[PDB]
Symmetry: C4
Subunit: 31 residues, 4 copies
């Protein structure tokens, strides 16, 4: 399980997607 | 196909490049 | 050690997490 | 060469580091 997939890869996607949620919301209210 | 390449890797590039398009445009109009 | 894990992967996580620390702090003071 | 290392990985690092150069400069002048 872990060997077939490392948590680093999952975190990478989460960091990008998660950041977008906050960053998108910031610009969502105003351009 | 999928085994040789996971969608997570592709998404990572898209997230970075995609975000840049929006982030770049924001600063494109003004410094 | 290095072969089992490349520094590029580690740097990637650091770049995302590190950037968040600075970016988060910027928005931390003000929305 | 290419098989041992894909351009996607290299681009990922460049995207993060490159973005930081521009993003850092923006905040460099002002907080
Ligand atoms: Br900057 C930055 C944002 C996201 C980053 C993670 N990218 C990778 C690309 C590929 C190599 C590793 C692990 C997976 C797949 C995610 C790093 S680096």
């Amino acid at each position: 399980s872990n060997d077939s997939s490392d948590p680093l890869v999952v975190a990478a996607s989460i960091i990008g997607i998660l950041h977008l949620i906050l960053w998108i919301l910031d610009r969502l209210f105003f351009k």
